[PDB]
From Swiss-Prot:
Induction: Expression increases early during phorbol ester-induced differentiation along the monocyte/macrophage pathway in myeloid leukemia cell line ML-1. Rapidly up-regulated by CSF2 in ML-1 cells. Up-regulated by heat shock-induced differentiation. Expression increases early during retinoic acid-induced differentiation. It comes from the Eukaryota. It comes from Homo sapiens. This is Induced myeloid leukemia cell differentiation protein Mcl-1. There is a cross-link at K24, K27 (Glycyl lysine isopeptide (Lys-Gly) (interchain with G-Cter in ubiquitin)). The chain holds residues 171 to 321 of 350 of the full protein.
Amino acid sequence: EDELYRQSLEIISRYLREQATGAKDTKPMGRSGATSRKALETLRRVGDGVQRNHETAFQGMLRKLDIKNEDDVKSLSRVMIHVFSDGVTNWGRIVTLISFGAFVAKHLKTINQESCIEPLAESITDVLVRTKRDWLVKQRGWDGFVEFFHV
Ligand SMILES: O=C(O)[C@H](O)c1ccc2c(c1)N(CC1CCC1)C[C@@]1(CCCc3cc(Cl)ccc31)CO2
């Protein structure tokens, strides 16, 4: 099918959900689980740092987007394409894309619109994979992501 898309969605979906609920999903990973597990660990370390280092900017952009419902959540894909896709690609910007998504995911829980988190993860994945596949493939995908941030 599309293994890069499938793996990307599982990783992003899980990180967003875990960020919003504060609990880990004990369900096993699908294909390429070992890598996905390392990718999630990486996001918990780096993504979490991003949300703090840029807390003020993140809080400001969130207020800007004024997210209250499903229509508002749907409006985010155009903004992601405008800001993320139309720019240089490097792991740092991909981490910001996902980190702000988690920031939004937490917001969705506060306003009791939790059922929008999964659709949101899907939208982030679409933007990332469908507009930056060449780069991702060249950078060795998630294996490369894990390698890049290795400590
Ligand atoms: O190039 C830049 O400026 C940065 O490097 C950069 C890179 C990616 C990126 C953003 C910035 N942003 C903007 C920043 C300002 C505080 C968050 C969030 C983004 C756009 C809004 C909507 C949206 C909604 C969701 Cl669910 C996720 C990501 C995003 C698009 O992802």
